[PDB]
Amino acid sequence: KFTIDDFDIGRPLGKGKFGNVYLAREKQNKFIMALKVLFKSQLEKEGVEHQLRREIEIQSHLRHPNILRMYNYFHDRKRIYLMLEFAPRGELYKELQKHGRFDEQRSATFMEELADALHYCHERKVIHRDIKPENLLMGYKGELKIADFGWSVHAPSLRRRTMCGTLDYLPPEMIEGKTHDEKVDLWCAGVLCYEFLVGMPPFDSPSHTETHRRIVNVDLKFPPFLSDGSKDLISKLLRYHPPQRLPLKGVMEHPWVKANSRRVLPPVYQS
Amino acid sequence: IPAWASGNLLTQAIRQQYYKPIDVDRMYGTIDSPKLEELFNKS
Numbered sequence: 001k002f003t004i005d006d007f008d009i010g011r012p013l014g015k016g017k018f019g020n021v022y023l024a025r026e027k028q029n030k031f032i033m034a035l036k037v038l039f040k041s042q043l044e045k046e047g048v049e050h051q052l053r054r055e056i057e058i059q060s061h062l063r064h065p066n067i068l069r070m071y072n073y074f075h076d077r078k079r080i081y082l083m084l085e086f087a088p089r090g091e092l093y094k095e096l097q098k099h100g101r102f103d104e105q106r107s108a109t110f111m112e113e114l115a116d117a118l119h120y121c122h123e124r125k126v127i128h129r130d131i132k133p134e135n136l137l138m139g140y141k142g143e144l145k146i147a148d149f150g151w152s153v154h155a156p157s158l159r160r161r162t163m164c165g166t167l168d169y170l171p172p173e174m175i176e177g178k179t180h181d182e183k184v185d186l187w188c189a190g191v192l193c194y195e196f197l198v199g200m201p202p203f204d205s206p207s208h209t210e211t212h213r214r215i216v217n218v219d220l221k222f223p224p225f226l227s228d229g230s231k232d233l234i235s236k237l238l239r240y241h242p243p244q245r246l247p248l249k250g251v252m253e254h255p256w257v258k259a260n261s262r263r264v265l266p267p268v269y270q271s
Numbered sequence: 272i273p274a275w276a277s278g279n280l281l282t283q284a285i286r287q288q289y290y291k292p293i294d295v296d297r298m299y300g301t302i303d304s305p306k307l308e309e310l311f312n313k314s
């Protein structure tokens with residue numbers, strides 16, 4: 001098992017509510033990763049122990065080029081340490097804010113990567129439930145990495161009831177108090193594509209009840225600068241009825257995605 | 272901040288890692304992990 005002394009600590013990458021993330025180098029392989037450090041007493045006081053256990057259980061069993069890898073984890077007297085893949089280009093949300101909006105090539109590439117990662121999850125009956133820019137990181141070549149699994153669930157048989165995620169990204173079925181399934185991630189993917197291309201989510205409103213109202217009416221108003229292809233894809237994802245939403249394989253196969261994505265798979269080991 | 276964790280020393284190491292990926296499954300995924308049950312218990 002690992003110990004904190006097995007790592008050179010480089011610098012803090014981000015502050016957290018329960019502990020910081022550090023750029024770290026594993027000493028024996030001189031391998032650069034991120035170390036998320038969590039305080040045991042703070043987690044216990046806040047009563048989020050089973051919550052954290054669930055996030056670790058899900059993320060540590062996922063292996064996909066577009067999902068941030070959790071290599072392993074360890075603990076000592078006071079701290080829990082998560083050994084995470086380092087995403088050299090950082091937060092996707094920072095990049096979106098910096099540019100205002102992404103061009104079609106950038107957005108289509110992200111969408112292919114997202115759809116592939118989400119397909120991998122759904123194949124395993126994992127629903128993410130909180131796809132938004134803030135939960136995505138970027139790799140060495142700008143590849144999307146799903147980073148955060150805080151609202152995620154393994155749902156093999158039972159439909160779900162928990163209202164979760166983020167206001168602007170909530171699907172109609174969550175707002176209306178219906179049961180939901182994996183198709184919530186299809187909805188969020190459509191909101192994400194819109195936000196990528198426009199720089200604001202589609203149902204943006206001054207109040208939570210107006211936002212709710214716009215979502216359940218699917219009050220989608222496309223800006224004039226969007227291509228027909230991008231609107232086609234967004235429209236096919238943002239369907240009121242979950243069963244009518246374009247499947248993830250359908251996103252990957254969509255002609256706008258095919259025509260615009262410049263997705264590159266990272267090099268793999270390497271026998 | 273140590274030398275390795277900034278500038279082009281970092282850039283260089285990061286590039287090398289992308290193009291020459293190690294066997295993380297073997298190197299890290301095979302190494303023992305604490306039981307999730309034990310994570311809030313004695314270390």
Ligand SMILES: Cc1cc(Nc2cc(N3CCN(C)CC3)nc(Sc3ccc(NC(=O)C4CC4)cc3)n2)[nH]n1
Nearest residue numbers: 013014021034084085086087088089090091137147148
């Ligand atoms: C965990 C992680 C983070 C990274 N990469 C980075 C990289 C980064 N950078 C600073 C800004 N430059 C322009 C790019 C590099 N800043 C952060 S700040 C930050 C901190 C934490 C998280 N993510 C999480 O804690 C996920 C696990 C829930 C994302 C970004 N994270 N690799 N792995």
